[PDB]
Enzyme design. Sequence first.
Site, PDB file in Angstrom:
ATOM      1  N   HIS A 115      73.557 -39.935 -43.250  1.00 58.85           N
ATOM      2  CA  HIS A 115      72.767 -39.499 -43.225  1.00 58.85           C
ATOM      3  C   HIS A 115      71.852 -37.859 -43.505  1.00 58.85           C
ATOM      4  O   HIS A 115      72.886 -36.879 -43.463  1.00 58.85           O
ATOM      5  CB  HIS A 115      72.194 -39.031 -41.347  1.00 58.85           C
ATOM      6  CG  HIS A 115      71.509 -37.968 -40.634  1.00 58.85           C
ATOM      7  ND1 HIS A 115      70.144 -38.737 -40.198  1.00 58.85           N
ATOM      8  CD2 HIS A 115      70.744 -36.474 -40.105  1.00 58.85           C
ATOM      9  CE1 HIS A 115      69.448 -38.023 -39.671  1.00 58.85           C
ATOM     10  NE2 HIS A 115      69.550 -36.782 -39.529  1.00 58.85           N
ATOM     11  N   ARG A 128      63.187 -39.491 -34.862  1.00 54.48           N
ATOM     12  CA  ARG A 128      61.926 -39.339 -35.144  1.00 54.48           C
ATOM     13  C   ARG A 128      60.840 -40.028 -35.165  1.00 54.48           C
ATOM     14  O   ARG A 128      60.072 -40.110 -33.973  1.00 54.48           O
ATOM     15  CB  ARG A 128      61.195 -38.460 -36.439  1.00 54.48           C
ATOM     16  CG  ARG A 128      60.315 -37.280 -36.157  1.00 54.48           C
ATOM     17  CD  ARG A 128      60.282 -37.066 -37.391  1.00 54.48           C
ATOM     18  NE  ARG A 128      60.794 -36.032 -37.936  1.00 54.48           N
ATOM     19  CZ  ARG A 128      60.770 -34.387 -37.451  1.00 54.48           C
ATOM     20  NH1 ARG A 128      59.549 -34.121 -36.242  1.00 54.48           N
ATOM     21  NH2 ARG A 128      61.850 -33.894 -37.706  1.00 54.48           N
ATOM     22  N   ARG A 187      59.152 -26.697 -31.576  1.00 53.72           N
ATOM     23  CA  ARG A 187      58.458 -26.252 -33.054  1.00 53.72           C
ATOM     24  C   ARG A 187      57.851 -25.834 -34.084  1.00 53.72           C
ATOM     25  O   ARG A 187      58.247 -25.237 -34.113  1.00 53.72           O
ATOM     26  CB  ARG A 187      58.064 -28.289 -32.946  1.00 53.72           C
ATOM     27  CG  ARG A 187      59.901 -29.230 -32.641  1.00 53.72           C
ATOM     28  CD  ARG A 187      58.946 -30.721 -33.736  1.00 53.72           C
ATOM     29  NE  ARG A 187      59.461 -30.789 -35.174  1.00 53.72           N
ATOM     30  CZ  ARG A 187      58.038 -31.024 -35.513  1.00 53.72           C
ATOM     31  NH1 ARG A 187      57.354 -30.905 -35.336  1.00 53.72           N
ATOM     32  NH2 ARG A 187      58.401 -31.513 -37.041  1.00 53.72           N
ATOM     33  N   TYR A 225      59.667 -23.388 -35.554  1.00 58.99           N
ATOM     34  CA  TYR A 225      59.517 -23.814 -37.012  1.00 58.99           C
ATOM     35  C   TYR A 225      57.876 -23.652 -38.334  1.00 58.99           C
ATOM     36  O   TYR A 225      58.260 -23.940 -39.287  1.00 58.99           O
ATOM     37  CB  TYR A 225      59.812 -25.617 -38.028  1.00 58.99           C
ATOM     38  CG  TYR A 225      61.329 -25.500 -36.136  1.00 58.99           C
ATOM     39  CD1 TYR A 225      62.132 -26.636 -35.640  1.00 58.99           C
ATOM     40  CD2 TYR A 225      62.971 -24.671 -37.051  1.00 58.99           C
ATOM     41  CE1 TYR A 225      63.222 -26.443 -35.027  1.00 58.99           C
ATOM     42  CE2 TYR A 225      63.958 -25.380 -36.664  1.00 58.99           C
ATOM     43  CZ  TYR A 225      63.846 -26.012 -35.503  1.00 58.99           C
ATOM     44  OH  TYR A 225      65.165 -25.602 -34.814  1.00 58.99           O
ATOM     45  N   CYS A 278      56.569 -14.398 -21.530  1.00 58.30           N
ATOM     46  CA  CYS A 278      56.022 -13.071 -22.338  1.00 58.30           C
ATOM     47  C   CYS A 278      57.141 -12.830 -22.975  1.00 58.30           C
ATOM     48  O   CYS A 278      58.739 -12.166 -23.026  1.00 58.30           O
ATOM     49  CB  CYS A 278      56.389 -11.826 -21.092  1.00 58.30           C
ATOM     50  SG  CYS A 278      55.510 -11.017 -19.847  1.00 58.30           S
ATOM     51  N   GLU A 279      56.629 -13.104 -24.576  1.00 62.09           N
ATOM     52  CA  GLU A 279      57.307 -13.147 -25.892  1.00 62.09           C
ATOM     53  C   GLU A 279      56.830 -13.284 -26.961  1.00 62.09           C
ATOM     54  O   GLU A 279      55.778 -14.281 -27.176  1.00 62.09           O
ATOM     55  CB  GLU A 279      58.298 -14.402 -25.647  1.00 62.09           C
ATOM     56  CG  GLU A 279      58.837 -15.123 -27.060  1.00 62.09           C
ATOM     57  CD  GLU A 279      59.772 -13.767 -27.965  1.00 62.09           C
ATOM     58  OE1 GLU A 279      61.027 -14.176 -27.489  1.00 62.09           O
ATOM     59  OE2 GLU A 279      60.214 -14.171 -28.904  1.00 62.09           O
ATOM     60  N   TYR A 290      61.404 -34.661 -30.380  1.00 69.18           N
ATOM     61  CA  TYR A 290      61.872 -33.341 -29.985  1.00 69.18           C
ATOM     62  C   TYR A 290      60.820 -32.344 -30.365  1.00 69.18           C
ATOM     63  O   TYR A 290      60.347 -31.017 -30.037  1.00 69.18           O
ATOM     64  CB  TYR A 290      62.313 -32.426 -31.836  1.00 69.18           C
ATOM     65  CG  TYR A 290      63.207 -33.403 -32.305  1.00 69.18           C
ATOM     66  CD1 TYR A 290      62.700 -34.689 -33.885  1.00 69.18           C
ATOM     67  CD2 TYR A 290      64.338 -33.605 -32.273  1.00 69.18           C
ATOM     68  CE1 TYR A 290      63.779 -35.486 -34.184  1.00 69.18           C
ATOM     69  CE2 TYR A 290      65.055 -34.401 -33.190  1.00 69.18           C
ATOM     70  CZ  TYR A 290      65.296 -35.461 -33.710  1.00 69.18           C
ATOM     71  OH  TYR A 290      65.454 -35.962 -34.946  1.00 69.18           O
TER      72      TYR A 290
HETATM   73  C1  LIG Z   1      68.932 -35.741 -35.250  1.00 67.47           C
HETATM   74  C2  LIG Z   1      69.583 -36.947 -36.426  1.00 67.47           C
HETATM   75  C3  LIG Z   1      68.999 -38.416 -36.971  1.00 67.47           C
HETATM   76  C4  LIG Z   1      68.042 -38.858 -36.717  1.00 67.47           C
HETATM   77  O1  LIG Z   1      67.061 -38.212 -37.292  1.00 67.47           O
HETATM   78  P1  LIG Z   1      65.527 -38.700 -37.419  1.00 67.47           P
HETATM   79  O2  LIG Z   1      64.724 -37.204 -38.331  1.00 67.47           O
HETATM   80  O3  LIG Z   1      64.632 -37.997 -36.273  1.00 67.47           O
HETATM   81  O4  LIG Z   1      65.188 -39.479 -38.190  1.00 67.47           O
HETATM   82  C5  LIG Z   1      70.191 -39.744 -37.081  1.00 67.47           C
HETATM   83  N1  LIG Z   1      71.042 -39.545 -37.570  1.00 67.47           N
HETATM   84  C6  LIG Z   1      72.166 -38.495 -36.994  1.00 67.47           C
HETATM   85  C7  LIG Z   1      73.442 -38.544 -36.948  1.00 67.47           C
HETATM   86  C8  LIG Z   1      70.516 -37.441 -36.524  1.00 67.47           C
HETATM   87  O5  LIG Z   1      71.616 -36.240 -35.785  1.00 67.47           O
HETATM   88  C1  LIG Z   2      60.894  -8.898 -23.217  1.00 68.10           C
HETATM   89  C2  LIG Z   2      59.766  -7.838 -22.322  1.00 68.10           C
HETATM   90  C3  LIG Z   2      60.602  -6.433 -21.740  1.00 68.10           C
HETATM   91  C4  LIG Z   2      62.299  -6.431 -22.610  1.00 68.10           C
HETATM   92  O1  LIG Z   2      61.775  -6.274 -23.759  1.00 68.10           O
HETATM   93  P1  LIG Z   2      62.739  -6.041 -24.760  1.00 68.10           P
HETATM   94  O2  LIG Z   2      62.851  -5.707 -26.274  1.00 68.10           O
HETATM   95  O3  LIG Z   2      64.639  -6.701 -24.766  1.00 68.10           O
HETATM   96  O4  LIG Z   2      63.670  -4.582 -24.656  1.00 68.10           O
HETATM   97  C5  LIG Z   2      59.626  -5.609 -21.551  1.00 68.10           C
HETATM   98  N1  LIG Z   2      58.429  -6.043 -20.971  1.00 68.10           N
HETATM   99  C6  LIG Z   2      58.480  -7.174 -21.095  1.00 68.10           C
HETATM  100  C7  LIG Z   2      56.553  -7.261 -20.571  1.00 68.10           C
HETATM  101  C8  LIG Z   2      58.989  -8.040 -21.489  1.00 68.10           C
HETATM  102  O5  LIG Z   2      58.173  -9.242 -21.508  1.00 68.10           O
END
Ligand SMILES: *Cc1c(COP(=O)(O)O)cnc(C)c1O
Ligand SMILES: *Cc1c(COP(=O)(O)O)cnc(C)c1O
Lengths: 421, 421
Positions: B190, B270, B306, B310, B341-342, B377
Amino acid sequence: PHSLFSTDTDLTAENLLRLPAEFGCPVWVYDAQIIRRQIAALKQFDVVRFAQKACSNIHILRLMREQGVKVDSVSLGEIERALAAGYNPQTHPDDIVFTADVIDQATLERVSELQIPVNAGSVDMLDQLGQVSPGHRVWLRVNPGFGHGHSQKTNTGGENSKHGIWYTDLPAALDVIQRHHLQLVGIHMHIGSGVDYAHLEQVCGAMVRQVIEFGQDLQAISAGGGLSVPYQQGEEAVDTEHYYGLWNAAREQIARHLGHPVKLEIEPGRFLVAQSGVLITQVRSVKQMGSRHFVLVDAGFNDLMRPAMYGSYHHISALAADGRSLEHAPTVETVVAGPLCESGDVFTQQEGGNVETRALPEVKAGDYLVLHDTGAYGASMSSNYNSRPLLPEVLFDNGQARLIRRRQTIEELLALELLHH
Amino acid sequence: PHSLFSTDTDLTAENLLRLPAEFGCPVWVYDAQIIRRQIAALKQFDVVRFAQKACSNIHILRLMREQGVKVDSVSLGEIERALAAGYNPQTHPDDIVFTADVIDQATLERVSELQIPVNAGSVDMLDQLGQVSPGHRVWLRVNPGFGHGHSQKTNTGGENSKHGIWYTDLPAALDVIQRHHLQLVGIHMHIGSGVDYAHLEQVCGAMVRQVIEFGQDLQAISAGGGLSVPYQQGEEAVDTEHYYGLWNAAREQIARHLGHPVKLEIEPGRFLVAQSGVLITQVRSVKQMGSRHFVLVDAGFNDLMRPAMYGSYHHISALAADGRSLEHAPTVETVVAGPLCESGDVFTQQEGGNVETRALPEVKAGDYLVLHDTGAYGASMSSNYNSRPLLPEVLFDNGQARLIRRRQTIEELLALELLHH
Ligand SMILES: *Cc1c(COP(=O)(O)O)cnc(C)c1O
Ligand SMILES: *Cc1c(COP(=O)(O)O)cnc(C)c1O
Ligand SMILES: [Li+]
Ligand SMILES: [Li+]
Ligand SMILES: [Li+]
Ligand SMILES: [Li+]
């Protein structure tokens, strides 16, 4: 991080080796006294409001509340967690604050019902709240025009951030406040400075500037969170007295302008809980791949997301199965990776994905690895990727380990899909 | 992806707008016939073994099984999912294969008990299996010395991959096979080639080389997965006939060497499910941040990982709340972001984190966005970050939408922590 042979905390070698046998593996472990220690370092602040998204277990929330720490919730789920931990909006209205950039229907109904103060991070959200809950007590999260880090990337502030009301949108926020008779409790910023004290001073200075310019009365300001922790040997730890000096000075200018005392909140997430937690995982496979020496364990990125997703550093220690000391054993450059059938499931990788090695004792299958400083954004970020169930959580307090979360089962995940058998 | 005004599938505009009202929002939606269409494109292969980590809902697994598609499980949880979907190791021993680089105690017991063939990706794992289940039917996942993509980064092959038995470790794997009398069923790789047909040819060529050199009899080979899908307008789709030509040619050389027919498996994840799925999310806040126009929705990266993790591209469409066509409405460069909140919770971002814009109609709060091609995914990677519960899943089949997963509750997450109340 702490050495496993320091033995000032409960996170020692003998203590950690026995945990997986009792509670299962892999497993999250937290040391209650380390959290209490972090809480005490911020004693100067009027209010320490824990950002529960860093570590949300209700028993850890209960510990916070016992220490007089309040809580910030960023979702309806986090509100329920806070209530389960004994926080009570009816007797103490400022113990829970709901903070976000958006608000959905269920949350609107819950915060209206309980009269939980809302820290709105969009004017739209402020309007939606006001329409259904006229006179609600609110905070305003302000984006002061800049964040922390690269100016092009996702950020906690600046124009490449989704967070908070843009500072020039403040007049529009005031119109919304006036339209619905909202009661302004305070003004907040969450930007984060780590130990960059010059950057921290810019945040403090923007708070003073923005509050005075906004020209409204309020009861409190919040410094937000973003206190860093030293994940790597030798890195500088936060000086809380320094944080206090700068934020108190900003609070004092605001209070002088308003003619009355203004309460100062700080809202740490990471700082309170990171160093208190570890993740224990068993070595399952050891093999050579070309020039790389690989050690695969039973915890993966679905458990601890940081290294795989962001290239974050977590110190790694090794524990021999039979308990012999590996303190001074020779080390080999090792690539540490998980059990997922997923290429990115490698704990020793840099930001951007480059694989790297870590100097570790030469462990075998059956031995354990300890990932240090996983108390913040460890269990809280976990996913079920590869149909893997949320791990158990264990809390140490004065040498005694107790279960504070049991292992999720596959049946519980399957029950969501079995709708009449 | 598909246009919402194509109306060849069930993923149309009127169809999508009504779903959130009936089933809740945000919500994952899948079109059964698109999955059937992808399955049919691989009809030349003897076996199509779905990599369920791409999309594991048991009703979608049942659909696979109905179409004669077998399943690959990469965890004990995935084994249980397969069994819940009606796959049966007792009547049909090759319907489920357990594939991983490591194996834990519970899994060893389960695969021994049910006699589920194991595709081992480490010699250690092969030994552990053999010791407790002598004579077990096994596959060997081989790392042929190279993967796909940058040579420094986490990979599906090559020395910077945790995956599979390094090709020069094959003699050591044979010793383990002989020691425990393991029965070699097949050899698997794979690596994944997308539409890079020259790279695909190197994988095929390595399979022939490695199998012949290993010198053992077997019943089957597997091409693994990694067929790509065109997430962006104009990108090239996989030519399955081309995939078949190259892999069949490798199978035929192996069969000629062995003196008997060899079965050819393909293991897509996928490819089968990506284009069948969408994610519907409501717009909650629209605001200007400096020079950026932000649209925040109620789904975040805990839901669809995703883009944030990524920098992956998912096409985005807009649906007006009242159903008026936005087909030809003017567009504005928009940054689309979630409710977490990120800071990283931004859907329109490049690999490495740079924020970018998407040309979209000018939506308001209450309107909906559709994230296209989320069948693979999407739900499978979801987390509970910010105490947000797993979303509901809906399956379309010939114009009829039915619930195949209900929304998880916060109570179900809290039950893990409430150990006697
Ligand atoms: C994730 C995975 C697949 C599928 O990968 P795709 O890119 O989604 O096609 C196939 N075999 C194994 C062992 C996997 O971990
Ligand atoms: C995540 C977050 C925090 C905490 O952030 P840290 O870096 O972990 O201290 C405080 N306030 C709000 C509104 C947040 O989203
Ligand atoms: Li930025
Ligand atoms: Li998990
Ligand atoms: Li690589
Ligand atoms: Li979720």
